[PDB]
Design a binder for this molecule. Structure first.
Ligand SMILES: *[C@@H]1O[C@H](CO)[C@@H](O)[C@H](O)[C@H]1NC(C)=O
Ligand SMILES: *[C@@H]1O[C@H](CO)[C@@H](O)[C@H](O)[C@H]1NC(C)=O
Lengths: 356, 362
């Protein structure tokens, strides 16, 4: 049988969509075929997100892979929770209890706080925007209170501070660093921490940091044989057929998208073994129906997704009962004179930066 | 003229004020016809459905509330469907069309008041359930102003992080000896949190809300601490006195939250919103939520005429001078600066949106 699934992609997310399509070929199985219904939209627009979500719902999809942002996250969590439709996402994780939301992206706050402590900072700037929520801001301020740190926290969305965390969209990093350089004051005297999971993604390291210290994080480890094999294939794909591919690296969001296909596939295999109906007809049903009478299979589908344990591009994939990644590792990177290098790792279980 | 009215469960006094406004501002020549629904504002699905049902009915505007979880539903649906939403809720950071914000921004007055007292080291007790936008404005300014801010989330008070909180508080209040403290929370949580802090005479609290005198002001007690805050409803205005003279005798069962000598600022703003809609709309069955997806948006050219009519209103209300900029933000208003004195709360000065500084009264 075929299993209907939805896809809600941001406009311009081409590599992500390519990774999605690569995933569907790679994890295809004789047991069933995934029939995706793909939409492209501005995910910052909660109305458009609602329309796309309801369109999928009326098609009777068994789960939706997609993206949200700060402006639409509440629409997703609320609609998923109401209608019992599972949403599997590489977007920023939330701390709220959110049933029916499967968050592929590991939380970064714990590793970031451990890294600050590892470098023994007690005074620094936290330059951020809200595009990935404000849980990291709160975590930094909470720890500053408890640890007696002096933090300057400025929303970027004549001072002798030299330690700087950048938790902002990739564009703003260049603008910020550029100012530092050209002020000449101790340019090599700075230490930047880049608070994202893609230290070696895109053009970040194309920035001229002028000999400053630069640290960051990475969830995709190119020393993994699993990752090495994937990149071998990925880098040889036809870019006209797979826009964003044919590259030597893959953005962490694209990696999580490919990983998401494996997780969904494993969940459906498990449901199939339990003889739970995952292909059904029929009728569209009404999204803003009253009462909201949610789907019975939804609870089992949600359960199956959260019970998945697999190894993927993003390492060990396992979730807690609230759809949050657990038991993962975040690689700690530094820009050494020869290039970016792993200096250690942070494990969700231990919650300590481990050197080497 | 049909309008929607979307009220959170428990906004009883606000609904009374709305009803009282309907009567006070009604005209033989013209009457608003409201369709009232009571909703869980923290639930974006429920907010979407209520908004869309009003859209379906064909209303000229929707009066209502949102919170940090549903504000994006409101701005997006307002902007897409071209239906004006008028609200007493927190004013948005960004600019968004088709939204009329009755509530004046507090950030500027708060920053000016911190400067006024010449603070340079203080605790900031915020709650993430309320939102962080005011906290952010303060943190942004701390850089330029040489401020040392210790920020603690008094949210998560019964929740998982309960432990870290009282630790931070203990460290700050007992160990660091902070003494200067801003409380950024719901007006009815002030009491609950101050008692926490007490468990001293030399403390100085700033209550970061627009309703200083709305709630408890003893002796609550603050234990001889200084207490300062903000008030947009001036009970010495003859407009406000007259309203209160009338409101104080309304029967409490018929008008929940009435028969009081004061009115919550959100209820004041709700009454003011009725005056605003009435002024704007002069001279210019059931609802199916599915219509949000089945029907096209109101043509922009039509919706915008209503939006502009609302934004152009200039009137005097319970909340003082009411005027809006092109983004629906209150401008040219005044916030009174209050301090709790031994004989009760007193107006010690004001902060005008035009000049943006705390001015001292004799
Ligand atoms: C940067 O890294 C160097 C090398 O260990 C260290 O000595 C320095 O203190 C770090 N911090 C800054 C701000 O440079
Ligand atoms: C508000 O005050 C400013 C500054 O005095 C004034 O110039 C402006 O005209 C006022 N705005 C309106 C809409 O009256």
């Amino acid at each position: 049988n075929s299993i209907q699934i939805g896809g809600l992609f941001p406009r311009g997310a081409d590599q992500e969509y390519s990774a999605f399509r690569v995933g569907m070929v790679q994890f295809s199985t004789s047991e069933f075929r995934l029939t995706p219904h793909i939409d492209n939209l501005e995910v910052a627009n909660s109305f458009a997100v609602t329309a796309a979500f309801c369109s999928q719902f009326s098609r009777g999809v068994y789960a939706i892979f997609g993206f949200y942002d700060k402006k639409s996250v509440n629409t997703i969590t609320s609609f998923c929770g109401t209608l019992h439709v599972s949403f599997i996402t590489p977007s920023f994780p939330t701390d709220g209890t959110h049933p029916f939301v499967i968050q592929m992206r590991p939380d970064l706050k714990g590793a970031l706080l451990s890294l600050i402590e590892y470098y023994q900072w007690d005074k620094f700037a936290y330059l951020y925007d809200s595009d990935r929520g404000l849980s990291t801001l709160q975590a930094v301020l909470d720890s500053a209170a408890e640890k007696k740190w002096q933090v300057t926290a400025i929303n970027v969305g004549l001072k002798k501070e030299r330690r700087v965390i950048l938790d902002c969209e990739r564009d703003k990093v260049n603008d910020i660093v550029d100012q530092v350089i050209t002020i000449g004051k101790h340019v090599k005297g700075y230490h930047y921490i880049i608070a994202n999971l893609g230290f070696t993604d895109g053009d970040l390291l194309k920035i001229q940091f002028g000999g400053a210290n630069v640290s960051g994080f990475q969830i995709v480890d190119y020393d993994d044989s699993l990752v090495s094999k994937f990149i071998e294939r990925w880098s040889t794909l036809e870019e006209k057929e797979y826009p964003g591919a044919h590259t030597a690296t893959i953005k962490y969001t694209s990696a999580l998208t490919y990983d998401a296909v494996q997780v969904m596939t494993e969940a459906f295999r498990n449901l199939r073994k339990q003889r739970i109906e995952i292909s059904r007809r029929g009728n569209a049903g009404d999204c803003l129906a009253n009462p909201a009478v949610p789907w019975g299979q939804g609870v089992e589908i949600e359960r199956a997704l959260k019970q998945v344990q697999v190894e993927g591009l993003s390492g060990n994939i396992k979730f807690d009962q609230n759809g949050k990644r657990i038991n993962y590792t975040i690689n700690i990177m530094e820009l050494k004179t020869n290039g970016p290098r792993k200096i250690g790792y942070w494990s969700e279980v231990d919650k300590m930066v481990v050197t080497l």
